[PDB]
Design a binder for this molecule. Sequence first.
Ligand SMILES: [Cl-]
Ligand SMILES: [Cl-]
Length: 162
Amino acid sequence: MNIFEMLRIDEGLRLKIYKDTEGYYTIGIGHLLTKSPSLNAAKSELDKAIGRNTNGVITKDEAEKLFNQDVDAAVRGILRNAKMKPVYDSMDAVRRAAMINMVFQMGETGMAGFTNSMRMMQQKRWDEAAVNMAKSRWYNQTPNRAKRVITTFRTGTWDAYK
Ligand SMILES: [Cl-]
Ligand SMILES: [Cl-]
């Protein structure tokens, strides 16, 4: 198991534009296209990302190419964030993968309400952080995903994914 396999389980793979769980147009392996309600807008955004006239449909290879970029972008966003870097750095590799998963899903911005959990995380208080994290919109909206990532933090193992 690794971050790629882990997120490919959490997000699935769809080769035609679809609506995510918040209703935003998405494609591929959780690649958000746009927060707007316009499909065309989504279609233009897709074409810009892929670099061709896609007509709302991409290949498996293109999906993966997007996924590679987005995972890389998530890591870098963590490293560039003054408040996350240090948390990330204090942790072991499995737990770092749990953090990247959250950042991928909710962006740096959504990560901001997690300030208190992150402190506990830094303090290595796993069980308390796990409890704190469940007290969130995130857990309430996508509970099964949230539990998997929360368990990962808690145990520092890949058990929730096997
Ligand atoms: Cl892009
Ligand atoms: Cl879920």
